[PDB]
Structure 1
Amino acid sequence: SQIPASEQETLVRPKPLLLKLLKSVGAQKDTYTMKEVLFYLGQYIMTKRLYDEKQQHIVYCSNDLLGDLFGVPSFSVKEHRKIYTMIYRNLVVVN
């Protein structure tokens, strides 16, 4: 019986600009799960300290490659659906 659709892993290939961003914090592959992409995005935001020191859910990126890739000047980590949409536009699903 097929794995429940919800439970199947989303395998993804970052387009070249997102791949460059992931490589900058140590990612060394071309293909990831969606969880791994999120991990590296966390590492990138943390490393470059893009978050507001006081309201740390808030990320500032208008002067960052991340803002060009997501297409926004800033965002909150709490915007789960929007962030998922922003990421998805920077990769191709691997069937």
Structure 2
Amino acid sequence: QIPASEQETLVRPKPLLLKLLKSVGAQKDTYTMKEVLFYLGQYIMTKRLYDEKQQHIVYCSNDLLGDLFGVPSFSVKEHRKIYTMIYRNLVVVN
């Protein structure tokens, strides 16, 4: 869904995305997009934000993730939509 070149893009999360990443063990100040997505997956999984049955549906209206993304819920199958939301929360480095 997302070209490898884009997944490999180097980025610097803005402070609130950063603090969220670090809350699930992230150790750096910059990341590839692939790494950002990896840690956001850890966040969603460990906080159990996904629907019990249709586990690709994420509910975030009672979480800081909803504030960061600007939505109450989303589907994890929509990778471009997710990337678009994440780019509003970081600065591209390279």
The alpha-carbon distance between structure 1 residues 3 and 27, as it changes in their structure 2 partners (threshold 3 A), is closer
TM-score, length-normalised on structure 1? 0.90
Q: Is the 8 A contact 2:51 2:57 kept in 1?
A: yes
**More moved, 3-12 vs 59-68:** 3-12
Choose 1 or 2 for highest CA Rg. 1
**More moved, 26-35 vs 6-15:** 6-15
Partner Cα separation in structure 1 for residue 2 and residue 54 of structure 2: 39
Which residue is 1:35 aligned to? 34
Which residue is 2:85 aligned to? 86
Q: CA RMSD in A?
A: 3.5
Partner Cα separation in structure 2 for residue 79 and residue 4 of structure 1: 14
Percent of aligned pairs with the same amino acid: 100
The alpha-carbon distance between structure 1 residues 50 and 30, as it changes in their structure 2 partners (threshold 3 A), is same
Shift of 1:6: 4.0
Q: Is the 8 A contact 2:12 2:92 kept in 1?
A: yes
Partner Cα separation in structure 2 for residue 33 and residue 71 of structure 1: 22
TM-score, length-normalised on structure 2? 0.91
Instruction: Could you tell me which runs of 5 or more consecutive residues in structure 2 were left unpaired when the two chains were aligned.
Output: none
Instruction: Could you tell me which runs of 5 or more consecutive residues in structure 1 were left unpaired when the two chains were aligned.
Output: none
The alpha-carbon distance between structure 1 residues 73 and 11, as it changes in their structure 2 partners (threshold 3 A), is same
**SS of the counterpart of 1:92?**
strand
Shift of 1:5: 9.9
* Per-residue Cα deviation, 1:8-54 (whole angstroms, up to 9, x for no partner): 93000000000011001000110000000000000000000000010
